mmCIF file of C-alpha atoms (C1' of nucleotides) in Angstrom:
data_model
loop_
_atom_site.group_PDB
_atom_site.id
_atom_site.type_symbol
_atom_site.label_atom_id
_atom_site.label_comp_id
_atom_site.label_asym_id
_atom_site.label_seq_id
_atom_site.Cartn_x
_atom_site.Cartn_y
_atom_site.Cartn_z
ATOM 1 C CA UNK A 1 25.849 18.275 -120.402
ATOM 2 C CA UNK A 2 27.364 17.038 -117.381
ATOM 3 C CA UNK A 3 28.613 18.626 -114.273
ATOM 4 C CA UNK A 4 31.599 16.362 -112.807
ATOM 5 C CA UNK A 5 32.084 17.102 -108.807
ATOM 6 C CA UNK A 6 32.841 15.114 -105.479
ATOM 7 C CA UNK A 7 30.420 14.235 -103.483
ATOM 8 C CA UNK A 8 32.140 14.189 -99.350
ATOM 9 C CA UNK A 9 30.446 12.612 -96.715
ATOM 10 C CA UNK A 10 34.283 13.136 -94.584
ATOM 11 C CA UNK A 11 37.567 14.684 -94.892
ATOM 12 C CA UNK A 12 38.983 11.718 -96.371
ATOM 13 C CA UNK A 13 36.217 10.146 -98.682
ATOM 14 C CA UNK A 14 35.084 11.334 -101.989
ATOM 15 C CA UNK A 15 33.329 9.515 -104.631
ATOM 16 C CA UNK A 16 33.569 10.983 -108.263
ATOM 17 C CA UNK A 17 30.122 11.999 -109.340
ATOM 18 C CA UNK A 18 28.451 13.482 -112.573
ATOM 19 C CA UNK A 19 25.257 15.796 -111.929
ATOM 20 C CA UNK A 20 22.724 16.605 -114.738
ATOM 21 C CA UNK A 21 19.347 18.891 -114.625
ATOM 22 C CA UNK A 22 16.929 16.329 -114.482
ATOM 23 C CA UNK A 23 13.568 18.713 -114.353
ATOM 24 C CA UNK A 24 14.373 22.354 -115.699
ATOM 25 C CA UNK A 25 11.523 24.902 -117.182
ATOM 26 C CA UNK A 26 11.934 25.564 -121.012
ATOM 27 C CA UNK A 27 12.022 28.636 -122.269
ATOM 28 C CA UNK A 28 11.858 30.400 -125.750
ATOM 29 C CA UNK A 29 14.959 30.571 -127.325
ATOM 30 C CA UNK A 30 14.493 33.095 -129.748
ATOM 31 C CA UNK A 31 13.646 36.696 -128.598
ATOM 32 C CA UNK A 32 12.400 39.398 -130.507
ATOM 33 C CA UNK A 33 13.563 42.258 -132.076
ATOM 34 C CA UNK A 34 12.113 45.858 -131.844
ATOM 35 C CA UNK A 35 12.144 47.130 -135.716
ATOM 36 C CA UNK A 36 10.744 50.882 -136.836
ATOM 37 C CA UNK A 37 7.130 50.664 -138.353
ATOM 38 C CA UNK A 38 8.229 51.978 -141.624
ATOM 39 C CA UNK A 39 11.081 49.850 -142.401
ATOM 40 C CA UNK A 40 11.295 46.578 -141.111
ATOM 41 C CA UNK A 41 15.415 47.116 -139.835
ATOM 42 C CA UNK A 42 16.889 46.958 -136.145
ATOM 43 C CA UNK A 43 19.806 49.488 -136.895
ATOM 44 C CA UNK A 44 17.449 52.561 -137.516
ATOM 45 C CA UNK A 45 16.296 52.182 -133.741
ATOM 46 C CA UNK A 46 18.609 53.315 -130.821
ATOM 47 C CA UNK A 47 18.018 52.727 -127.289
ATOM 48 C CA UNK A 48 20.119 54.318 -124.419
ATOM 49 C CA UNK A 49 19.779 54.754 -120.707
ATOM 50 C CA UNK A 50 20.293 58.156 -119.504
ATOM 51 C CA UNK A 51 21.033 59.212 -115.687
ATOM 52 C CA UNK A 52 20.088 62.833 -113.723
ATOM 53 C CA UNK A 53 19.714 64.607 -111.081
ATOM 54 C CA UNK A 54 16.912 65.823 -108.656
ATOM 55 C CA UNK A 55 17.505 69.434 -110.123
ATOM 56 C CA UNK A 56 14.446 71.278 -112.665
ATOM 57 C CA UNK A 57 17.645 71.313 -114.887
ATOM 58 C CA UNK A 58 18.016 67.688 -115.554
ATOM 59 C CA UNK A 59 21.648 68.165 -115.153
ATOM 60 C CA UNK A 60 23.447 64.875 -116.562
ATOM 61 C CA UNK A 61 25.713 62.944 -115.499
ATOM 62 C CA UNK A 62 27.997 60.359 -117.030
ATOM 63 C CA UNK A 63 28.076 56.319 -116.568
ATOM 64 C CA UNK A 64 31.733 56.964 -114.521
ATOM 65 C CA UNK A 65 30.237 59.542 -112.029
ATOM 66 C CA UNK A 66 27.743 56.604 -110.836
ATOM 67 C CA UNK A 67 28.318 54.922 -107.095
ATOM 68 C CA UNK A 68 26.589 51.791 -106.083
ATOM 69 C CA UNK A 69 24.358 52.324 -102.789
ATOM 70 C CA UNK A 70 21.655 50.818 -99.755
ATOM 71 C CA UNK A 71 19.032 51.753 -98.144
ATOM 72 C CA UNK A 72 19.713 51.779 -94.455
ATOM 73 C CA UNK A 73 16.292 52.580 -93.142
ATOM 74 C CA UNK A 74 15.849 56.501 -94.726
ATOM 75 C CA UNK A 75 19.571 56.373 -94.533
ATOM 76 C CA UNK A 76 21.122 56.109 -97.961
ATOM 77 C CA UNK A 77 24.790 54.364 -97.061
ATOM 78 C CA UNK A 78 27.280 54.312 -99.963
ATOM 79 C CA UNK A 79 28.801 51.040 -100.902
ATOM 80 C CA UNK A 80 30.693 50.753 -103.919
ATOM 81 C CA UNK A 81 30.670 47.939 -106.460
ATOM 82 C CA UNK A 82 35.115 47.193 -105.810
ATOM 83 C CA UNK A 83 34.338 47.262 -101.757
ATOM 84 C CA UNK A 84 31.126 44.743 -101.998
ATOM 85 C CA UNK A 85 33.940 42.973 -104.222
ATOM 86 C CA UNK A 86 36.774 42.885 -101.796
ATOM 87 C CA UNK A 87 33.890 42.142 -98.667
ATOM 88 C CA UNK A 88 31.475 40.136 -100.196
ATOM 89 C CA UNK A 89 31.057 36.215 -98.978
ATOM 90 C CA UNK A 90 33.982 34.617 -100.032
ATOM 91 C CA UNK A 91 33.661 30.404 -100.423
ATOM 92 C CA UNK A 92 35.164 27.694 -102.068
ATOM 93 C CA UNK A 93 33.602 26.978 -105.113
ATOM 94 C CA UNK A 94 32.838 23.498 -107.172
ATOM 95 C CA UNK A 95 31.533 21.711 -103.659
ATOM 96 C CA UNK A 96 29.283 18.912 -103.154
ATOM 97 C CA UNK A 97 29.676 18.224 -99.280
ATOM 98 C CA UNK A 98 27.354 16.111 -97.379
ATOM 99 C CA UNK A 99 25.894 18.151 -93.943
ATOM 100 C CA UNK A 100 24.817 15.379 -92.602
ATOM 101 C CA UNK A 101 21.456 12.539 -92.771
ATOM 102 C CA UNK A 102 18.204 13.081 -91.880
ATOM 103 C CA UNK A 103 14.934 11.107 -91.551
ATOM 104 C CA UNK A 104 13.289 11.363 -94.820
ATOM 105 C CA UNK A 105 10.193 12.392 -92.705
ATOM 106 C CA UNK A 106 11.530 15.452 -91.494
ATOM 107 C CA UNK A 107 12.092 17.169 -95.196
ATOM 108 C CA UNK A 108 8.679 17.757 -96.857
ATOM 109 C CA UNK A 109 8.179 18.813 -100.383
ATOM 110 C CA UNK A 110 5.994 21.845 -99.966
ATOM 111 C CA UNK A 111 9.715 23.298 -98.504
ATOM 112 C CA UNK A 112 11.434 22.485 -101.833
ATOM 113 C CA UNK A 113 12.895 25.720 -103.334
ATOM 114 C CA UNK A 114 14.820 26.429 -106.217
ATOM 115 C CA UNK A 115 13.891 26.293 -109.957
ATOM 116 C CA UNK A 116 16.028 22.898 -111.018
ATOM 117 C CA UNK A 117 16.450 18.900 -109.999
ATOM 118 C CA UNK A 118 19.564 18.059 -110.193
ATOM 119 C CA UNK A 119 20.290 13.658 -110.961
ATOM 120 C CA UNK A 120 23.629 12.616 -109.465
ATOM 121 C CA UNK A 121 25.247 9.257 -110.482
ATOM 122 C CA UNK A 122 28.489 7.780 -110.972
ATOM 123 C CA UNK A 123 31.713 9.421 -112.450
ATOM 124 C CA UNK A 124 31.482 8.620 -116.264
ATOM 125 C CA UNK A 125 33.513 5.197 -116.671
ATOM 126 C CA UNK A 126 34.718 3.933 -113.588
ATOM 127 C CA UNK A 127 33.419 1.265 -111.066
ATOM 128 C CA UNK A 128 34.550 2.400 -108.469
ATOM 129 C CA UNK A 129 32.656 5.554 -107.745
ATOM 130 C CA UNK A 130 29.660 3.563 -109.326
ATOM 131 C CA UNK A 131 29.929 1.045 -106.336
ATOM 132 C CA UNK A 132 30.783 3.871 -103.579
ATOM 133 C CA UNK A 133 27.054 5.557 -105.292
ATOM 134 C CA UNK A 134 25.488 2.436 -104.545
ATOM 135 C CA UNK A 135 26.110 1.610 -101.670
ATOM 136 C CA UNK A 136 25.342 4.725 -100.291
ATOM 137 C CA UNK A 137 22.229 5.066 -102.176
ATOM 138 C CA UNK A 138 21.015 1.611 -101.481
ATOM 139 C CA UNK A 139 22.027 2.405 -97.366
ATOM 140 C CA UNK A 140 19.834 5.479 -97.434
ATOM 141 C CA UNK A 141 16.550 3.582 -99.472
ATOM 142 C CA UNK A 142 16.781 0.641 -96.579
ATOM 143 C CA UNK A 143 17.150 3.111 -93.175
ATOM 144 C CA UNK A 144 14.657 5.541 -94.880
ATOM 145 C CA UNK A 145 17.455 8.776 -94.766
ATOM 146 C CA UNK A 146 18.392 12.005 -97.115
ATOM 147 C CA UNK A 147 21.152 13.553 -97.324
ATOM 148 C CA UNK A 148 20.882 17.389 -96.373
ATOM 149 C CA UNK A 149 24.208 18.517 -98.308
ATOM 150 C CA UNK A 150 25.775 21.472 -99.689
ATOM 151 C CA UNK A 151 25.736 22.904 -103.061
ATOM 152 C CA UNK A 152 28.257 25.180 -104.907
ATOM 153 C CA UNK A 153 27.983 25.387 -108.571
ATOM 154 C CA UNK A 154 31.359 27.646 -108.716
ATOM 155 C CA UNK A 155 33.325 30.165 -106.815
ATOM 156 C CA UNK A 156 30.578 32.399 -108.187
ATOM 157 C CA UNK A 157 27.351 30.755 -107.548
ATOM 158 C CA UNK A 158 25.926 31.561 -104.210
ATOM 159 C CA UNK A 159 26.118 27.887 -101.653
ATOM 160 C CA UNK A 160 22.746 26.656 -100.970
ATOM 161 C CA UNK A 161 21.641 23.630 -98.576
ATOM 162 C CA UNK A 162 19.805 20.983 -100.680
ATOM 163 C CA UNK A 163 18.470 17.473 -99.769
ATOM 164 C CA UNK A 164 19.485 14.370 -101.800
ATOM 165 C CA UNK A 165 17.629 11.274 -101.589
ATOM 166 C CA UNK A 166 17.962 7.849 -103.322
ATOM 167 C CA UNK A 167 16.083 7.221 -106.623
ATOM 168 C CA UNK A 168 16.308 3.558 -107.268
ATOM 169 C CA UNK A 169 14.689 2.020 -110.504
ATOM 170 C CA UNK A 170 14.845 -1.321 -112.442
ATOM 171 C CA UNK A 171 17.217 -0.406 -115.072
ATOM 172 C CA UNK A 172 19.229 2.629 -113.498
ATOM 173 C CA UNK A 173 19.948 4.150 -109.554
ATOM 174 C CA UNK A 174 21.047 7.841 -109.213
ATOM 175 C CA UNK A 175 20.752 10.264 -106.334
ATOM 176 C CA UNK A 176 17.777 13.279 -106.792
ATOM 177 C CA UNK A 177 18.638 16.710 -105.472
ATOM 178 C CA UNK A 178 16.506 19.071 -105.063
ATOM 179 C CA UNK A 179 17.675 23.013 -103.179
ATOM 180 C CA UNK A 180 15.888 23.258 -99.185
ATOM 181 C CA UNK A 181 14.828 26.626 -97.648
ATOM 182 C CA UNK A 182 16.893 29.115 -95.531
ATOM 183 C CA UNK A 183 15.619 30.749 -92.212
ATOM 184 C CA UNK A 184 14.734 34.064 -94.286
ATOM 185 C CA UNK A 185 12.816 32.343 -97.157
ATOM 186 C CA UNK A 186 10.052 30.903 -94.615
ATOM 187 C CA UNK A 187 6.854 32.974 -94.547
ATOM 188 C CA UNK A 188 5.505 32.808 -91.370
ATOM 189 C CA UNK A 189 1.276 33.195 -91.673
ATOM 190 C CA UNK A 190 -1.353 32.873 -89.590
ATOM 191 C CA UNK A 191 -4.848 31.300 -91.296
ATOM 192 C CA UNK A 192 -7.945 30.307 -89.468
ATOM 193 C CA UNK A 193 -9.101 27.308 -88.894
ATOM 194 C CA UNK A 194 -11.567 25.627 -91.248
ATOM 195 C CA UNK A 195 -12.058 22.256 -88.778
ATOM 196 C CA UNK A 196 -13.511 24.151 -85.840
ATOM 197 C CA UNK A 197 -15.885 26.851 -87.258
ATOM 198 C CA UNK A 198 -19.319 26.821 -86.683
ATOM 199 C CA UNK A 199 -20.223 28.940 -89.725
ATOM 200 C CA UNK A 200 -18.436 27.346 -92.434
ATOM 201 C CA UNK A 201 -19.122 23.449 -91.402
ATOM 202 C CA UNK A 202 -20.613 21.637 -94.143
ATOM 203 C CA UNK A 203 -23.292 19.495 -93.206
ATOM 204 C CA UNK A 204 -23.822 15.390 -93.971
ATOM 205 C CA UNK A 205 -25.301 15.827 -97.546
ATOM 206 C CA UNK A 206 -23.115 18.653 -98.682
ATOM 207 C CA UNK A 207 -20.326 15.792 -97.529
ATOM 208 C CA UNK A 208 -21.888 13.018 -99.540
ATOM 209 C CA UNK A 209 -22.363 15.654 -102.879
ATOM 210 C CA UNK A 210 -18.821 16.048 -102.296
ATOM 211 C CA UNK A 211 -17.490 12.660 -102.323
ATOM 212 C CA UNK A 212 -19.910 11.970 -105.024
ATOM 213 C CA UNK A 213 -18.620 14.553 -106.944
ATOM 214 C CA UNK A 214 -15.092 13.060 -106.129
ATOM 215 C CA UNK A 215 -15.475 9.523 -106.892
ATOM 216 C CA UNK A 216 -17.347 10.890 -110.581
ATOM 217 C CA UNK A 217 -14.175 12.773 -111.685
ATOM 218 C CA UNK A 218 -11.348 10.226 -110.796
ATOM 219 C CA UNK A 219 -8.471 10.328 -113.198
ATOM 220 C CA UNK A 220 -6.831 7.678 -112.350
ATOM 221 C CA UNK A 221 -8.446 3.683 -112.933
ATOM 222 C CA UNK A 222 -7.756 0.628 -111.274
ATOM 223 C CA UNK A 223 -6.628 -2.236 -113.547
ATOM 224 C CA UNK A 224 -8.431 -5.931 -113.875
ATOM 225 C CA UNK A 225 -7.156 -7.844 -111.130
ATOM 226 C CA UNK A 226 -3.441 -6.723 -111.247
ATOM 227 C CA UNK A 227 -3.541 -3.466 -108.566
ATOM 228 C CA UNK A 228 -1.632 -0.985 -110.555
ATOM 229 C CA UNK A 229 -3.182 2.589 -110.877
ATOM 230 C CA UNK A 230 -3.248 3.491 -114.834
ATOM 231 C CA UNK A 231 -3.309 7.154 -115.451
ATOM 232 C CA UNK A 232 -5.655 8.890 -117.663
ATOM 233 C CA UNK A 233 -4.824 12.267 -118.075
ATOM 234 C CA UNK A 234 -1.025 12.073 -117.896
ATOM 235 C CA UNK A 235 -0.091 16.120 -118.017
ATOM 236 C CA UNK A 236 3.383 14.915 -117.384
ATOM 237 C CA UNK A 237 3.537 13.616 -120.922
ATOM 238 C CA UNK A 238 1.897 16.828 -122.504
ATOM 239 C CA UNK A 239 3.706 19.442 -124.619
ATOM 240 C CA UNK A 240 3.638 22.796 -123.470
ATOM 241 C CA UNK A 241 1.193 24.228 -125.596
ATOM 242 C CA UNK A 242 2.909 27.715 -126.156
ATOM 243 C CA UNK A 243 5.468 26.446 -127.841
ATOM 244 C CA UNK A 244 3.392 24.835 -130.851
ATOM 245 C "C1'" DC B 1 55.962 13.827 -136.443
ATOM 246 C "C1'" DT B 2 54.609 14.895 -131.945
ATOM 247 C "C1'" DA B 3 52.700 16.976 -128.161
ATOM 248 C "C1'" DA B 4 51.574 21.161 -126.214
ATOM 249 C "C1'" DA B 5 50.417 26.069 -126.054
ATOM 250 C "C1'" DA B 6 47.247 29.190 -127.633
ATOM 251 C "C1'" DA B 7 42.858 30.371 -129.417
ATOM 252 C "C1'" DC B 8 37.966 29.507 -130.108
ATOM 253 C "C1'" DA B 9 33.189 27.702 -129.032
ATOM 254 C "C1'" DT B 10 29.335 26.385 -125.366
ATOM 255 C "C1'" DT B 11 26.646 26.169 -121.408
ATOM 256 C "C1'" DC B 12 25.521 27.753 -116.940
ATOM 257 C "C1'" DG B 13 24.853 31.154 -112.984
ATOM 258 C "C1'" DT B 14 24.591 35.782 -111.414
ATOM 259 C "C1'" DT B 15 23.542 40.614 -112.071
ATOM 260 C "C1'" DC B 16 20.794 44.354 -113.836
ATOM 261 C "C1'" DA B 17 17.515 46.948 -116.407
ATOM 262 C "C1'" DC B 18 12.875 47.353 -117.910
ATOM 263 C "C1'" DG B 19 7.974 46.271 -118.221
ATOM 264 C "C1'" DT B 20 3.715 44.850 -115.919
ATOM 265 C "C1'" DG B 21 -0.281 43.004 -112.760
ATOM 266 C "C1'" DA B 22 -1.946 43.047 -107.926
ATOM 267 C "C1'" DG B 23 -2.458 44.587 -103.002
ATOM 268 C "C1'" DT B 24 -1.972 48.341 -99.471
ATOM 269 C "C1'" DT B 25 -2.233 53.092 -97.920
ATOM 270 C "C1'" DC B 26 -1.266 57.751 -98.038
ATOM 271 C "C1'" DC B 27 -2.744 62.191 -99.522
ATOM 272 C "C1'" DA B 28 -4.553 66.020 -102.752
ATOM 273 C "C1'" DG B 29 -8.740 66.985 -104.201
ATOM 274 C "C1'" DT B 30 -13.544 67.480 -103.573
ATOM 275 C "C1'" DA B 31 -17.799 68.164 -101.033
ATOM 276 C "C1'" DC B 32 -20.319 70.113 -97.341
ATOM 277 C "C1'" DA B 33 -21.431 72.886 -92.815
ATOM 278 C "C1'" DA B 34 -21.015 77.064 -90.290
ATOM 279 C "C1'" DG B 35 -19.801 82.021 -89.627
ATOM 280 C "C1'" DT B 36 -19.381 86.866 -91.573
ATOM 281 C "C1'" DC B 37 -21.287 90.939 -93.802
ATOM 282 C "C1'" DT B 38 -20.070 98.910 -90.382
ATOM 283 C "C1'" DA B 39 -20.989 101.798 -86.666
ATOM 284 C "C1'" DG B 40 -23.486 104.664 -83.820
ATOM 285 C "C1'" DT B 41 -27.462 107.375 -81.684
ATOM 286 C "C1'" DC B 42 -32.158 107.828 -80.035
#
DNA sequence: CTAAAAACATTCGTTCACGTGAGTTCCAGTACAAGTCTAGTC
């Protein structure tokens, strides 16, 4: 399916745009069922959740008597599910707003979050929007630029900060989108240094055994006299085994 | 006949609940060492 939104770069320009989910995990569509040993039905097993107190009686207490809390630092804060409601981080959903441009140097792809790529081209039939795509497509690919933009799925769906960058190919030209990191996702590590350690140095011939070993596993093969890499073991073009 | 208002069907994202493997550390449990064993007279 398609997901039909407006990509901004102003307050006064918008250019009709359709997204799709270019790259998305598959998953099993069928779950299972838990059925009683004896007799292979679902309706002779019932499952409930049950809530109690921190009594020896197990006194119980009913779905209704239940408030949402937090953990404040061994300071348990009530906060009930109508007040996060009313308080929670209110936004206008449906938005596809460009931040601004960045070199594409400066966004790396070991930053890439998210679990989805997202292919952005033209509104379905008009040429208008298809023009305003390309030209803005084909002005990023020449000054070498991505777009760090916005991303709202709905009112619902929590706005992220995503990079878009031009995808230009013989037949077809769309925009790839792919979510960026906050400030709170970045792990901040310390490792030591491998270049500058007199105990773990490899010497000259454990150097050549590796690049020996390198050049005798190469997947990939250069062609006769054309210079264009032929790949052979494509993964990308393998089923996912658990399916089958 | 006609369009439009209502109802119905689909996909996606978010939330939550449960189950489970892996890493860290805190503590109950165990083991072991050392001291005690009555008070007095002559």
């Amino acid at each position: 399916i398609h997901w039909p939104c407006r990509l901004t770069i102003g307050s006064n320009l918008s250019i009709r745009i359709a997204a799709y989910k270019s790259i998305l995990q598959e998953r099993v569509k069928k779950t299972w069922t838990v059925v009683d040993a004896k007799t292979l039905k679902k309706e002779d097993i019932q499952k409930e959740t049950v809530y109690c107190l921190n009594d020896d009686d197990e006194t119980e207490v009913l779905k209704e008597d239940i408030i949402q809390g937090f953990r404040y630092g061994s300071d348990i804060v009530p906060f009930s599910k109508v007040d996060e409601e009313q308080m929670k981080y209110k936004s206008e959903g449906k938005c596809f707003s460009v931040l601004g441009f960045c070199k594409s140097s400066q966004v790396q792809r070991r930053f890439f979050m998210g679990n989805q790529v997202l292919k952005v081209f033209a509104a379905r039939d008009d040429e208008a929007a298809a023009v305003a795509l390309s030209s803005l497509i084909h002005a990023l690919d020449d000054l070498d630029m991505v777009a760090i933009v916005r991303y709202a799925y709905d009112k619902r769906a929590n706005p992220q900060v995503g990079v878009a960058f031009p995808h230009i190919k013989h037949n077809y030209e769309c925009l790839v989108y792919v979510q960026l990191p906050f400030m709170e996702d970045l792990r901040q590590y310390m490792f030591s240094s491998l270049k500058n350690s007199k105990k773990y140095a490899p010497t000259e011939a454990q150097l050549n055994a590796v690049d020996a070993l390198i050049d005798s596993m190469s997947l990939a093969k250069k062609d006769e006299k054309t210079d264009t890499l032929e790949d052979l073991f494509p993964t990308t073009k393998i089923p996912n085994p658990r399916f089958q």
